[PDB]
Design a protein around this ligand. Structure first.
Ligand SMILES: *[C@@H]1O[C@H](CO[C@@H]2O[C@@H](C)[C@@H](O)[C@@H](O)[C@@H]2O)[C@@H](O[C@@H]2O[C@H](CO)[C@@H](O[C@@H]3O[C@H](CO[C@H]4O[C@H](CO)[C@@H](O)[C@H](O)[C@@H]4O[C@@H]4O[C@H](CO)[C@@H](O)[C@H](O)[C@H]4NC(C)=O)[C@@H](O)[C@H](O[C@H]4O[C@H](CO)[C@@H](O)[C@H](O)[C@@H]4O)[C@@H]3O)[C@H](O)[C@H]2NC(C)=O)[C@H](O)[C@H]1NC(C)=O
Ligand SMILES: *[C@@H]1O[C@H](CO)[C@@H](O[C@@H]2O[C@H](CO)[C@@H](O[C@@H]3O[C@H](CO[C@H]4O[C@H](CO)[C@@H](O)[C@H](O[C@H]5O[C@H](CO)[C@@H](O)[C@H](O)[C@@H]5O)[C@@H]4O)[C@@H](O)[C@H](O[C@H]4O[C@H](CO)[C@@H](O)[C@H](O)[C@@H]4O)[C@@H]3O)[C@H](O)[C@H]2NC(C)=O)[C@H](O)[C@H]1NC(C)=O
Ligand SMILES: *[C@@H]1O[C@H](CO[C@@H]2O[C@@H](C)[C@@H](O)[C@@H](O)[C@@H]2O)[C@@H](O[C@@H]2O[C@H](CO)[C@@H](O[C@@H]3O[C@H](CO[C@H]4O[C@H](CO)[C@@H](O)[C@H](O)[C@@H]4O)[C@@H](O)[C@H](O[C@H]4O[C@H](CO)[C@@H](O)[C@H](O)[C@@H]4O)[C@@H]3O)[C@H](O)[C@H]2NC(C)=O)[C@H](O)[C@H]1NC(C)=O
Ligand code: HEM
Ligand code: HEM
Ligand SMILES: *[C@@H]1O[C@H](CO)[C@@H](O[C@@H]2O[C@H](CO)[C@@H](O[C@@H]3O[C@H](CO)[C@@H](O)[C@H](O)[C@@H]3O)[C@H](O)[C@H]2NC(C)=O)[C@H](O)[C@H]1NC(C)=O
Ligand SMILES: *[C@@H]1O[C@H](CO)[C@@H](O[C@@H]2O[C@H](CO)[C@@H](O)[C@H](O)[C@H]2NC(C)=O)[C@H](O)[C@H]1NC(C)=O
Ligand SMILES: *[C@@H]1O[C@H](CO)[C@@H](O[C@H]2O[C@H](CO)[C@@H](O)[C@H](O)[C@H]2NC(C)=O)[C@H](O)[C@H]1NC(C)=O
Ligand code: 8PR
Ligand code: NAG
Ligand code: NAG
Ligand code: CA
Ligand code: CA
Ligand code: CL
Ligand code: CL
Ligand code: CL
Ligand code: CL
Ligand code: CL
Ligand code: CL
Ligand code: CL
Ligand code: CL
Ligand code: CL
Ligand code: CL
Lengths: 573, 570
């Protein structure tokens, strides 16, 4: 059973909820907000058996839907005047705090075969594909690991390998073996392990991982730079993400250092926990104070996230299956380059803009092409992409995803849609209904909902009914909320999820007993610009709201102008 | 994939809901309305490991709770002036339409706590069981995902959730074909080939490996019956109702053959089955449930039907399997049999319940079903009172004749809720939007009974830990109902989903013609008894309320029969 008193989070999230102690813990099934919809009722995804209809209509190929609706010419790309690319990157990093859906290891081999045999669910290629002319080819896809393998009885559900809580588990890990390996066990300073072979202008980099089949090595053979080791396994997927992970590692070590000065008699354990506790609170505050309001807009923010009252032990904090797909809205924010800038915020030469298809798993570009400062600068001073109904997502992810390290480039929009079918998620209208929103039955009604009859027509041509529209596709097709970057449906799902992660987290930073009133006063002062200042060689940063500020010099200030975190109230006699 | 058109229910309930076709089908996990509460978070029930507390307090022995709170002296028993014993029996029969939770080696003879056994420990100073090294046998319910460290243990419903008379027809296709008369093209159910009840049909016999009905008598050598549900023989009153509905099927198939001579056996079976199903729905929702819930809760939880809603989940909830056991408080300690003058039928007009369990011989050799049905109609149910919860015939002597020791059904109810990982009273109160008492004083207010509140806190320590059955049946009854607010909410909520989420609900456009629905509105359970037994005087009005001979009785000739005119075809 659970300790009747405790001071800190467990690593796995076990015991956050004392009455049902696995809720929000790692390696458990997702909760379902709606009953699953599988071709055979309990296991096989729609699109599995050729010729089998969904709810009266043919299943559209995920790749076909991507081609006809998501595809757009890259020269048309609209930059978001009101959002930085840091808005995109915080979303990915946050996602990697919340959910990871494990797949079986490459092994019959889904990566090299186009045979549809468990556990493979390859994406078929439509006729007249702009890229893949051989229709006997396919895009690789492994089905998500089931919670109960080989069962006839259970309705297939998938697994979340992370703690659902906003607890910085992407830094500290969600399993105890990994969480100990991430720590510096050389001394009693309560530090996280740092790279022993390289530094970034004197500052720390993430340790290297020891992988059986390391993909970062494939991106540059001569460089011989492996993937990094972090709390989450996807830390090296793009260098912008790596940058944020690195930034938070440093911030942990900085805090543990300052707490050692302040409380000299604290051992390594106490320093680690207390630093971890703060980093967690900082991720909560940036997310709920700065990030989410700009996702949802002010109306939805009031509706779905009213003022915090207190912890409610009857609120289920698990990640919902649908959330893993809906929170992928952020794929519409992705620019087709990685932007690097020098200390004058000027294109850092020789390669200021690297195509995304050449940065995936390219840990070598962090170690050998100037560290994280140029990348963080690019995030702060470049605009996000804007989602528009005829410019949904760029070809660097739709045509060339992981191009360097796979037999064929993937299509992330199409994977989003195959994945929703794999997970047995209901269609657009079922989720509309779940959210208390009107459900369009006809092309005209869908036109009204989308304020776009052209797009409504394309969707009905693919899907036949709005009942069958894949949740991602429908969600991101919707016109955006005032001062937000999602439509009503995604607002509802995302809002609902984050409310539960807050109200049902016993260690929420505002919950009575977690922090003293003076510590909460102090924590209210933190910001992400400040964290960049404290832990990089950057001295000019974005004005608050870092997710909106996107134009040099107009939206920038000196580091000296910003309030630091005062750790005075953490001192003990 | 589901047939895009169909006329009749599948046997398994597959394809009722076309978007999620397993919903309400047989042999699937229960739905959870709340997250499970297990000692280890995912599998072990509270009370499993000695010394491990629940939510700050020791776990009370289920048998101790039964002894201190459920036990009452049988001479104090209060009869319900407003409810027949038929009200009790229809509840059990309906339950056997909705849910059966299957179990799996050594649990029947061993008191060692080793999976899958979860034996009930005996407290000191037990009124009945003096040997503290003994125990009450208990098998844990089967898990949906055996041996998993990942999944939160959930249990299985072997029946169709729908109100579809699956206790008559079966919930699996092998069994459903064996229940049919495949000798001819009349669409009949199989009847007993060795015995009759004054010329009328009895249920076939089952072929069981370990048949308990044989143990009851022994010289009589009468095995258990075979029905849609495996529990048909558990008491003869239940057997009577099963038998009654078998006859009613065969009667309807007969009349439809006259009316439509060119219909084959399949068409007759399905069309008769369709009617019997509608009759079970109508008696349940029109006659039964209003008297369970009372008029307030009935309006709240079961407003006027509109139409089928394919987004309503019709699965049975895990908690319902335990909450709907409220009907154990309605059970009288005798089986009552009456002759055609409604007078004690000799020999043995009142048999102790501990001598009727699995006693199929008493149907075949002691006068058939007419005396039993008469006893149900003309005897009062027991009334649930806070100091008279459940009788010792089920608390002390359950299944005494057919196993090594008498069971305690109230205690099993409570061990079972822990087995299933159900939250305690307050979590369910909260789920229902009801106030959650934290102190003995608040619990006194809620129960309108400070004495009972004190006893419960002595056992449980907090209202958070009170077992759902125990808490539910402790609550004062609603005006003109026989459950409190919490059970009203759970039961009401469940039956609303079974109605609004059933594609084959009898009022749903397209199931029956408008003329067939006019005709079906006329059916009643008294009528069904008339049509299919040698009984000619039956209960008035609301059979579940009518409980006193002659005051509440009428002649069969006074009642309208079911007009099958609108079932005729060219
Ligand atoms: C601590 O947090 C608990 C969880 O709250 C939910 O999650 C949090 C994060 C917020 O988003 C909350 O706003 C959200 O509600 C709270 O407990 C919940 O309280 C509500 C209100 O009393 C309870 O609702 C009641 O549910 C009864 C049972 O029926 C429910 O379940 C069925 C199957 O699950 C489903 O068919 C029903 O639709 C219903 O589901 C609820 O729907 C309503 C509205 O869409 C929601 O408000 C509920 O959250 C849903 N619950 C679930 C579990 O999915 C109903 O009978 C009852 O409504 C009846 O009475 C009211 C007036 O009395 C009438 O308006 C209405 O006509 C109806 O007849 C009510 O809806 C809910 O079950 C509780 N959840 C749990 C886990 O117990 C706590 O209240 C909160 N405590 C504090 C101090 O803040
Ligand atoms: C756990 O935590 C500890 C403490 O925080 C980490 O210790 C650090 O290890 C790294 C790498 O293993 C060291 O970096 C190397 O530094 C040497 C020279 O060290 C000197 O200069 C430092 C510069 O600021 C200075 O801090 C050092 O002072 C400390 O150490 C001395 C002597 O032990 C001690 O007495 C003092 O009191 C201080 O504690 C010292 O003056 C440098 O030569 C190395 O160069 C490498 O890289 C180059 C390429 O640029 C390569 O070409 C070289 O040949 C070589 O490979 C390297 O930069 C760092 O000095 C350590 N810091 C401290 C505070 O001890 C430890 O790593 C953590 N473990 C894990 C797993 O994270
Ligand atoms: C057909 O039936 C559908 C299900 O009906 C339910 O069961 C039947 C038998 C009745 O009891 C009925 O009353 C039940 O509703 C029905 O769909 C349901 O419609 C409601 C209302 O639109 C939906 O509730 C809304 O849900 C969203 C999402 O949150 C829910 O899920 C989370 C996670 O599980 C829970 O924590 C929440 O408590 C919710 O349960 C909510 O965001 C939303 O509340 C917000 O918006 C409303 C309206 O503005 C505000 O009043 C609130 O304060 C919030 O701001 C609602 O709670 C429900 O999800 C939905 N269920 C399904 C399965 O879709 C359907 O409408 C019926 N249709 C017809 C045609 O008859
Ligand atoms: C490479 C990828 C990115 C590069 C910038 C990227 C970005 C984001 C943002 C901005 C997100 C949210 C705001 C976000 C969320 C989630 N993603 Fe996505 N993403 C990249 C790559 C992937 C890939 C590949 C997947 C898996 C696709 C598949 O179905 O096979 C992916 C998923 C997700 C996801 C679900 C996570 C999970 O539980 O497994 C998000 C919530 N991303 N990304
Ligand atoms: C013998 C038993 C009965 C009568 C002589 C009897 C009566 C009822 C009524 C009147 C019910 C509803 C109003 C009702 C519901 C449910 N019961 Fe209960 N019951 C008798 C015996 C049992 C036994 C034995 C069990 C199982 C005991 C255990 O848990 O160890 C039992 C259960 C149930 C039940 C749950 C059924 C399931 O899903 O498996 C009801 C809904 N009854 N009974
Ligand atoms: C088990 O079943 C047997 C029947 O198979 C039961 O035996 C029966 O007991 C009754 C007791 O009244 C006998 O009734 C008697 O019948 C005779 C002849 O008409 C009559 O003279 C007596 O006055 C009385 O009415 C019945 O005949 C007898 N049947 C047989 C075949 O022996 C037995 O009692 C059952 N087990 C029990 C209840 O312990
Ligand atoms: C199947 O149905 C037939 C016809 O309804 C049953 O046959 C009758 O059986 C009774 C007694 O068992 C006989 O006395 C009648 O003379 C038979 N009637 C006819 C028309 O043949 C048959 O027994 C049924 N089978 C089962 C298993 O119930
Ligand atoms: C692979 O990594 C090497 C580092 O090992 C990167 O480049 C090297 O190539 C640059 C390209 O202009 C040279 O200017 C560098 O001096 C050189 N560095 C070393 C140590 O050899 C190389 O560009 C990477 N390859 C690709 C195609 O990106
Ligand atoms: F640890 C993890 C990181 C990323 C994931 C991703 C989840 C979505 N599906 C694709 C997965 C990436 O798999 C890859 C990527 C590059 C490769 C590779 C396989 O073989 C050699 O080069 C899974 C596990
Ligand atoms: C689960 O854990 C138990 C208890 O230690 C172990 O005996 C069992 O073999 C494990 N099984 C699986 C399938 O993970
Ligand atoms: C039923 O008919 C009988 C005659 O068989 C008659 O005496 C009796 O009064 C009728 N009604 C009632 C209520 O018993
Ligand atoms: Ca987490
Ligand atoms: Ca049924
Ligand atoms: Cl879901
Ligand atoms: Cl290293
Ligand atoms: Cl905040
Ligand atoms: Cl368009
Ligand atoms: Cl700078
Ligand atoms: Cl439940
Ligand atoms: Cl037989
Ligand atoms: Cl009705
Ligand atoms: Cl025996
Ligand atoms: Cl009392």
């Amino acid at each position: 059973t659970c300790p009747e008193q405790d001071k800190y989070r467990t690593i796995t999230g076990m015991c956050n909820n004392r009455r049902s102690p696995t809720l929000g813990a790692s390696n458990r099934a997702f909760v379902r907000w709606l009953p699953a919809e599988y071709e055979d009722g309990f296991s096989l995804p729609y699109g599995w058996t050729p010729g089998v209809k969904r709810n009266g209509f043919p299943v559209a190929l995920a790749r076909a839907v991507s081609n006809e609706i998501v595809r757009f010419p890259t020269d048309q790309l609209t930059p978001d005047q009101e959002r930085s690319l840091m808005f995109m990157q915080w979303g990915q990093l946050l996602d990697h705090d919340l959910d990871f859906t494990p797949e079986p290891a490459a092994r019959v081999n889904c990566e090299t075969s186009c045979v549809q045999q468990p556990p493979c669910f390859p994406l078929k290629i439509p006729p007249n594909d702009p890229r893949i002319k051989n229709q006997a080819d396919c895009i690789p896809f492994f089905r998500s690991c089931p919670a109960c393998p080989g069962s006839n009885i259970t309705i297939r559900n998938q697994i979340n390998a992370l703690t659902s809580f906003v607890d910085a588990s992407m830094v500290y890990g969600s399993e105890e073996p990994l969480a100990r390996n991430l720590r510096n066990m050389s001394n009693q300073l309560g530090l996280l392990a740092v790279n022993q072979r390289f530094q970034d202008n004197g500052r720390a980099l993430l340790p290297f991982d020891n992988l059986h089949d390391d993909p970062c090595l494939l991106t540059n053979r001569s460089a011989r730079i492996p993937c990094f080791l972090a709390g989450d396994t996807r830390s090296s997927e793009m260098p912008e993400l790596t940058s944020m992970h690195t930034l938070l590692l440093r911030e942990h070590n900085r805090l543990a250092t300052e707490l050692k000065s302040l409380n000299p008699r604290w051992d390594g354990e106490r320093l680690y926990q207390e630093a971890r506790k703060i980093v967690g609170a900082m991720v909560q505050i940036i997310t709920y104070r700065d990030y989410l309001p700009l996702v949802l807009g002010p109306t939805a923010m009031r509706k779905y996230l009213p003022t915090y009252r207190s912890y409610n032990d009857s609120v289920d904090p698990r990640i919902a299956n649908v959330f893993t797909n809906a929170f992928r809205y952020g794929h519409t924010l992705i620019q087709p380059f990685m932007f690097r800038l020098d200390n004058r915020y000027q294109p850092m030469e020789p390669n200021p803009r690297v195509p995304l298809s050449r940065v995936f798993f390219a840990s070598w570009r962090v170690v050998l092409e100037g560290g994280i400062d140029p990348i963080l600068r690019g995030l702060m001073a470049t605009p996000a992409k804007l989602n528009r109904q005829n410019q949904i997502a760029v070809d660097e992810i739709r045509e060339r995803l992981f191009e360097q390290v796979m037999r064929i480039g993937l299509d992330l929009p199409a994977l989003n849609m195959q994945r929703s079918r794999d997970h047995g998620l209901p269609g657009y209208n079922a989720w509309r209904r779940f959210c208390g929103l009107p459900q369009p039955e006809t092309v005209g009604q869908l036109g009204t909902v989308l304020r776009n009859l052209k797009l409504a027509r394309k969707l009905m041509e693919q899907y036949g009914t709005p009942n069958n529209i894949d949740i991602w596709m429908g969600g991101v097709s919707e016109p955006l909320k005032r001062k937000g970057r999602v439509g009503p449906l995604l607002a509802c799902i995302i809002g609902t999820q984050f409310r539960k992660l807050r109200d049902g987290d016993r260690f929420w930073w505002e919950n009575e007993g977690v922090f003293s009133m003076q510590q909460r006063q102090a924590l209210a002062q933190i910001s992400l610009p400040r964290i960049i200042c404290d832990n990089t060689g950057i001295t000019t940063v974005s004005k608050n709201n870092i997710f909106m500020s996107n134009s040099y010099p107009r939206d920038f200030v000196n580091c000296s102008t910003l309030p630091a975190l005062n750790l005075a109230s953490w001192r003990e006699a």
